[PDB]
Amino acid sequence: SIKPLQIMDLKHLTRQFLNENRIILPKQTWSTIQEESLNIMDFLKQKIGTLQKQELVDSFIDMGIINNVDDMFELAHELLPLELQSRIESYL
Amino acid sequence: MDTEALANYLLRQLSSSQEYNKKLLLACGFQAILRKILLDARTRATAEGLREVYPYHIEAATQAFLDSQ
């Protein structure tokens, strides 16, 4: 199966997230998050089968991540590199 | 691994400014949901109380995540 994403990539991504909230992860924890990332990705493909601005804001609201488009581009600001979140703001 | 590199990953498994922004926002969603899973794992680690977020905590986080979504 070609779907899996690497454990090292998850380590690099979550290292920055540890600073916002310090999660500490044993090895088999790393392996389980890597394994269940496949299930997460499939569930997301169910939840988001196609990409649109209204569709993605509605999906993320359904996910409980956000409450409105305001929260959505707040998330984009806190998750993207500087020029990009402005580029997305041009899209909204 | 960049957030736009996560967008590149989602592009590789999925298939120009509009689509660029769409895929960047999809990467934001994926990253946020990974963070949610890890945060719920930490929450489960609080219920058990030992040192670190042992794997069954991420597991339980995933079942709660699916049971609420």
Partner: peptide, 27 residues
Amino acid sequence: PWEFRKVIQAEYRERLPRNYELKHWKK
């Protein structure tokens, strides 16, 4: 009767959990 899509629109809703949001149905 032949079209199975109309049947599935009812099957999936009872199939998957109610909290499993079927807001979007992939091709």
